[PDB]
Amino acid sequence: KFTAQQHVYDINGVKVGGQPGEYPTVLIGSIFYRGHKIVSDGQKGIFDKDAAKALLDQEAELSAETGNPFIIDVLGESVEALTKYVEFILENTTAPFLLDSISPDVRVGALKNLGKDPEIQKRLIYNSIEEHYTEEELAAIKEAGLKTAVILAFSKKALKPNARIDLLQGKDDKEGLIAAAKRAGIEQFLVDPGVLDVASNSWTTEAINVVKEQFGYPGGCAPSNAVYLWKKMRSKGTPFFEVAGAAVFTYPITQGADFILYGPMMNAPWVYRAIATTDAMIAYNNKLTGVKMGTTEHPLLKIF
Amino acid sequence: KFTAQQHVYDINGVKVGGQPGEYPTVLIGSIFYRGHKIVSDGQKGIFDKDAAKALLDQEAELSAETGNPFIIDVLGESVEALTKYVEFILENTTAPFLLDSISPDVRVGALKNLGKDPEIQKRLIYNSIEEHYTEEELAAIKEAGLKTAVILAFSKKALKPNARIDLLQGKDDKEGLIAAAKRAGIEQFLVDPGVLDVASNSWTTEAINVVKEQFGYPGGCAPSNAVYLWKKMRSKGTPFFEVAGAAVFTYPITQGADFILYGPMMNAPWVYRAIATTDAMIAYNNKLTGVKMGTTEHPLLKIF
Ligand SMILES: CN1c2c(O)nc(N)nc2NC[C@@H]1CNc1ccc(C(=O)N[C@@H](CCC(=O)O)C(=O)O)cc1
Ligand code: NA
Ligand code: NA
């Protein structure tokens, strides 16, 4: 149990945050990521609408089966592409989504196109306010009227978990990431301490623990970051890659994390089954602890 | 990190126990279990020795790959069979092994057949000292001069973790299982709180935690039966069954457990890959917990 009262955000019906076992893990699958075979032109955003819809429908079905809610990680390499991807996602699912790009300018340009749309304020989560945030980024976020952001509380200057306190709150003459986000009008903060490689997932989970223990923000991470590039394991094929991936993806949940970016959506069928199992066992512990489940739509009550 | 000074046993070269990240998880696969198809006659103990040897060779190869040590769970349904299986295991692997039957009469009979033998004393772990123990059984153990036993707190009269601790440590007019084992001359206790079902694997793990917190004995469990009786998930096939399995099997390790009985040895190729991944992440945490690795034969140093 965490000492700070936990923030539980309701993002278009998706509950994120809470004490361990209160709410199911929110699963965040990537679409239109680099090399995604349903994209034929990543600059113009030419993509397979039927295939994308099938992924979204599959996500909805797996979510209905296990009780794990979902937020879509929408990636783009160009303003044109990401704008089109977001338009498609708004139309073809109800889920919140991350506005995501390796390049901040792509996120900024996409926000200008999408505009201060009330639906965008409700369902678009800015991914992310990072160490090297710019003023034009904060201006774009404010002009779009966004209310929820991922705070990527990661730096090579703050490798230790306790150093996330410094990143979020600020230190010396440096504005904290929470302060920066608030200046941009953000009111809900999903804290992601970042993942470098598979092993370092344990440090990321410790950071999540610090953040929940001291501030009560929802904490999560992207364990997929080094898993898909782990060729030694992936080249082994099924089911070796999936069980290795399952070990990585479930680990933060076992230490009280609230959300996981599990990588390409095509992996959802095995990811949901692994994560739901972990959630079930954690929630069963509530019987001893006295923690009450926030919802009846929980893996514990669904997967057996 | 656990409160009590941890007992680390050296079971004929296999280290088991310690603080999280100190030693790799010990993996314990079952051979000659009920319905194991390499067995042509379970009453007489007639089996395909080449197929059995192939399993043992595979275990050694997987162990060499990840750094996870292995102890073989040797099951038998008759005194005749189990005696032959133990003789085979002694000459076809160097590893320690569990003398295992659901029938106490079978364990005791086999053990009597094995006599007083330094190799048996070094390699044979009695599975298990459990609630139905008899003075005959304790005397047979003492006569064999065994030094290590699995202490199994599986009981439908002890569901909650604290009730399992009561079974282990004694309460009221019961000496408890640890005390019973000591009377049999056991000096090393591999504590297995039992797995009642998949969801209650978290209670199993809580019991392991209390054992390590208060006594410092190595703790582990055997979730394979619970996983194989999970019809809903098993019906989904591969790789869904395996990733669910992996979530269950790795969960206790994420909470500091020392060993897992992972079920049939045929499942070793995926179990080792999942467990090694968890071990790698936990050992990476060692700086944060103030733990030192007790060996360089550790997944963190092998699987990347
Ligand atoms: C960087 N990381 C990340 C993070 O750590 N935190 C936030 N908030 N957001 C994000 N967004 C993107 C990413 C998480 N999602 C991912 C992570 C990794 C992959 C991935 O490895 N894709 C593969 C290609 C796909 C494949 O091989 O199947 C690659 O080589 O790039 C795909 C998506
Ligand atoms: Na949760
Ligand atoms: Na094997």
Residue numbers in the entry:
A (entry chain A), B (entry chain B): 3 to 306
Lines from the paper:
Herein, we present X‐ray structures of THF‐ and THF‐CH3‐bound MtgA that allow us atomic insights into the reaction trajectory of this catalyst. In contrast to substrate‐bound MtgA, the entire cofactor is defined in the MtgA:THF‐CH3 complex depicting extensive coordination within the amino acid environment in a rigid manner. However, the THF benzoate moiety is now involved in a π‐stacking network including Tyr230, Phe243, Phe251, and Trp272 on one side, as well as Tyr35 and His38 on the other. While the functional groups of the THF tail engage water‐coupled hydrogen bonding interactions with adjacent residues, the terminal γ‐carboxylate forms salt bridges with Arg236 that coordinate the cofactor in an extended conformation. In contrast, the benzoate group of THF‐CH3 displaces the carboxamide side chain of Asn227 by 2 Å (red double arrow). Notably, the active site lacks residues to deprotonate the (THF‐CH3)+ intermediate; this decreases the conjugated electron system within the pterin ring system. On the other hand, the WT MtgA:THF‐CH3 structure illustrates an intermediate that forms immediately after CH3 transfer from Cbl‐CH3 to THF.
During energy production in Desulfitobacterium hafniense, MtgA catalyzes the methyl transfer from methylcobalamin (Cbl‐CH3) to THF in the catabolism of glycine betaine (GB). Despite its lack of sequence identity with known structures, we could show that MtgA forms a homodimeric complex of two TIM barrels. The topology of each subunit is characterized by a funnel of eight parallel β‐sheets connected by α‐helices on the outside that form a complex of two perpendicularly oriented TIM barrels. The active‐site cavity is located inside the hydrophilic core of each barrel.
